[PDB]
Structure 1
Amino acid sequence: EALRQARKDAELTASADSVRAYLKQIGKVALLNAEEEVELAKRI
């Protein structure tokens, strides 16, 4: 509950440091596995 509000408040922060901001934005998307890779490549 309070932890949830804390996490949300955190997500709305700049962190100034541009490396820090990019390192934050790259973690949004999860990784994949082999079958996901092959289906994705087939789509491409």
Structure 2
Amino acid sequence: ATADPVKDYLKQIGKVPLLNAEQEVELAKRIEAGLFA
């Protein structure tokens, strides 16, 4: 919580795992699995 809220938003993005090909195709596979569920 500081001034210039865009900076705090950027930190809120933080460090998250960027997705390579197989990672995201598996994610979409389980996405459609949950959709069918």
TM-score range, shorter chain: 0.5 to 0.7
Could you say which residue in structure 2 is the equivalent of 1:36?
Answer: 23
TM-score (norm 2): 0.64
Runs of 4+ more than 6 Å apart: none
Q: 1:5-42: per-residue Cα shift (whole Å, max 9, x none)?
A: xxxxxxxxx34321000111112212010000100001
Structure 2, unmatched stretches of 5+, are 32-37
Q: Number of matched residues? A: 31
Please tell me the root mean square deviation across aligned C-alpha atoms, in Å.
Answer: 1.3
Q: Report the identity percentage.
A: 81
TM-score (norm 1): 0.57
